[PDB]
Paper text:
Because active-site inhibitors of [name] suffer from bioavailability and selectivity limitations, notwithstanding some progress in bypassing such limitations, there has been an increasing focus on the potential of allosteric inhibition. However, to date none have been clinically approved, illustrating the persistent need to elucidate conformational ensembles and allosteric mechanisms in this protein. RT crystallography can reveal alternate protein conformations, which can interact with one another to imbue proteins with allosteric properties.
In this approach, a vacuum source in a humid chamber is used to load microcrystals onto a chip, which has a base that is compatible with standard goniometers at synchrotron beamlines. We use two different processing pipelines and obtain very similar results with both, demonstrating the robustness of processing data from the [name] chips used here. By contrast, in our [name] structure the active site is best fitted with a single conformation, but the distal allosteric site is best fitted with alternate conformations. This observation argues for additional nuance in interpreting the nature of allosteric coupling in this protein. Our data set allows us to draw comparisons to other existing structures with regard to the conformational ensemble of truly apo [name]. As may be expected, our model is broadly similar to the dozens of ligand-bound cryo structures and the smaller set of RT structures in different conditions. However, despite its moderate resolution relative to past single-crystal structures, our data set also indicates a degree of allosteric decoupling that adds nuance to the previously reported paradigm of allostery in this protein.
Numbering used by the authors: 1 to 284
The structure:
């Protein structure tokens, strides 16, 4: 592992903030005209986190097709992700319309509904089996089937029914619940174990639609997920834990959504998780 001694080299030199700035500067920049139309102002959670028009997800609704969401297509790894913001009270129906239209099998949530005294996300899934949710604007019903609460994540089977065709699908909600309010987790082990549960569920398999991933803005903790999954997969395809340049992967993902990886602590954590997750992918 080169990166393991490049990692040790960057900590010594304390220069995480420097590399992270390098990436901010090299990062690509494309139009996001649709996002900043005023008809869409209230469809965005942060005024400065916009999907690029080229990689954006379109709702199949000729009235307004906008939702703040990007398709990240990683060609060498054969892995696609949909990165999105946490739904607004007025976009919850859109969010499930998107999960329906894209044929996604799983949703990964990396935030709690309330963080730092504020609401980072609408409550967009049901809490009790018997209290189903109806989305009138998008003709969808959502039902909680089961719920498996563990120490640092919760998994939920949900049933999504299309009212106007009577088709149903089962969605897996993977909810990481212990991401620190400030900073990043002290060890990646929790995060890695959550990652592998998502993998084992099949939600990433390419017979399915792309997994929907989000946090508050869909770039910070969301990117850490995607970057770690993809780096670890490329280490497999090459079965060589050192042809993978984590900064080069990051810059390629940022062609598809701006700002992935928000802090330089997140970047360090990204390295830390890939290095550690490499143990259990090189035979173990």
């Amino acid at each position: 592992m080169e990166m393991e001694k490049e990692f040790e080299q960057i900590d010594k030199s304390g220069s995480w903030a420097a590399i992270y700035q390098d990436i901010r500067h090299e990062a690509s920049d494309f139009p996001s005209r649709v996002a900043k139309l005023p008809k869409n102002k209230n469809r965005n959670r942060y005024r400065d986190v916009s999907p690029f028009d080229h990689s954006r997800i379109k709702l199949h609704q000729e009235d307004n097709d906008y939702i703040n969401a990007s398709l990240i297509k990683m060609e060498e790894a054969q892995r696609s992700y949909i990165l999105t913001q946490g739904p607004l009270p007025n976009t919850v129906g859109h969010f499930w319309e998107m999960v329906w239209e894209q044929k996604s099998r799983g949703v990964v949530m990396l935030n709690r509904v309330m963080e730092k005294g504020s609401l980072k996300c609408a409550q967009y899934w049901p809490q009790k089996e018997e209290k189903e949710m109806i989305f009138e604007d998008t003709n969808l019903k959502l039902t909680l089937i089961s719920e498996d609460i563990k120490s640092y994540y919760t998994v939920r089977q949900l049933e999504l029914e299309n009212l106007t065709t009577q088709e149903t699908r089962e969605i897996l909600h993977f909810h990481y619940t212990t991401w620190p309010d400030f900073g990043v987790p002290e060890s990646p082990a929790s995060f890695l174990n959550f990652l592998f549960k998502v993998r084992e569920s099949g939600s990433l398999s390419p017979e399915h639609g792309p997994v929907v991933v989000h946090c508050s803005a869909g770039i910070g903790r969301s990117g850490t997920f995607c970057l770690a999954d993809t780096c670890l997969l490329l280490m497999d395809k090459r079965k060589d834990p050192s042809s993978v340049d984590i900064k080069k992967v990051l810059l390629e993902m940022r062609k598809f959504r701006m700002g992935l990886i928000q802090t330089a602590d997140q970047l360090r954590f990204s390295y830390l998780a890939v290095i550690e997750g490499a143990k259990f992918i090189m035979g173990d």
